[PDB]
């Protein structure tokens, strides 16, 4: 009953906005919207409260509030507009978390999806962090239609272009988290990442990222994106050259020593694809001491570390240089 009261205020304002849109300007501060959505943002963390929202159509009301405000004011620097979009996006993130129906519902609302992707160019990096968090959950365990819609709206190129100009670590985590999920969907999603100018140079840079807090989130995310797209880079000489001049192969060998099992797994997966069909990078891996380091990881307890290290070793051992023996 109390949540119904809050959701009705949003829907009442949404209808007031659509009445103006058909004619042509209602402001959100006058109707007391940002306080109402701020309560729903906080209520969306609890699981029992999320079930109450889903029955009363809470995801649809909050999404349309975010949609209509983006269409009206655009990419404004107004505090009340941005703060409203932040609290709305934070609620949608929680509603999309662990709910296949809600992921499909927000994806199917194509007006809102276009409105979401446009906010990545905003000056507020807090807003970029909130938008990237929504796209992370939508990209995770996406159905066929949801995968196709995320590609249609152009979230892959928007997030990668955004990631270059990001300053804060919290924003950069959420953006790279979404791109890692998006890269795993299909081959065309991987091409869109590599197609962005200076994107591969950035992803190599994240391997040696100097973190503020004691966490390996940015290295795992950036290297995790690199692992997925390396299959396309393996069949491309131009992209390989970008990795050489930024020292990628030499860095990925250092990642084998890491205590983080994700970083080692990402490195072995990247070295699997890059080791095949290229005599130049093959000979480089022999010189840097890849055979010794990869031979240590063949007897690992985990599946992907053991599979990736053994497979990359197979490619190097099969194609020995003339210099050796």
């Amino acid at each position: 009953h109390h949540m119904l009261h809050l959701l009705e205020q949003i829907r009442a304002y949404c209808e007031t906005c659509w009445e103006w849109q058909e004619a042509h300007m209602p402001a959100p501060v006058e109707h007391q919207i940002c306080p109402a959505v701020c309560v729903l943002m906080k209520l969306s963390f609890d699981e029992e409260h999320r079930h109450a929202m889903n029955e009363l159509g809470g995801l649809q009301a909050i999404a349309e509030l975010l949609q209509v405000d983006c269409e009206m004011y655009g990419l404004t620097n107004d505090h009340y507009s941005i703060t409203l979009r932040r609290y709305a996006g934070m609620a949608l993130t929680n509603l999309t978390f662990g709910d296949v129906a809600n992921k499909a519902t927000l994806c199917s609302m194509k007006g809102c999806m276009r409105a979401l992707v446009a906010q990545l160019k905003s000056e507020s990096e807090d807003l970029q962090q909130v938008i990237a968090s929504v796209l992370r959950n939508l990209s995770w365990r996406a159905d066929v239609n949801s995968k196709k819609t995320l590609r249609e709206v152009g979230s892959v190129k928007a997030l990668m272009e955004c990631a270059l100009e990001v300053k804060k670590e919290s924003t950069l985590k959420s953006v790279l988290s979404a791109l890692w999920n998006l890269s795993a969907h299909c081959t065309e999603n991987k091409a869109d990442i590599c197609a962005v100018d200076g994107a591969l140079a950035f992803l190599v840079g994240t391997l040696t990222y100097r973190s503020q807090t004691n966490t390996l989130a940015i290295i795992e995310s950036g290297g995790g994106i690199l692992r997925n797209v390396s299959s396309l880079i393996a069949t491309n000489e131009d992209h390989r050259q970008i990795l050489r001049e930024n020292n990628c192969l030499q860095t990925l060998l250092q990642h084998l020593k890491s205590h983080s099992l994700t970083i080692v797994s990402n490195a072995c997966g990247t070295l699997w694809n890059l080791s095949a069909r290229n005599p130049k990078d093959q000979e480089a891996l022999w010189d840097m001491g890849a055979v010794s380091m990869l031979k240590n990881l063949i007897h690992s307890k985990h599946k992907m570390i053991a599979m990736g290290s053994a497979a990359a070793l197979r490619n190097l051992m099969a194609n020995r240089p003339a210099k050796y023996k």
Binding site: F45, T93, F97, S133, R136, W140, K173, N181, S221
Partner: peptide, 8 residues
Amino acid sequence: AGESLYEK
């Protein structure tokens, strides 16, 4: 990367 609630 997985899924997550909002990084507060």
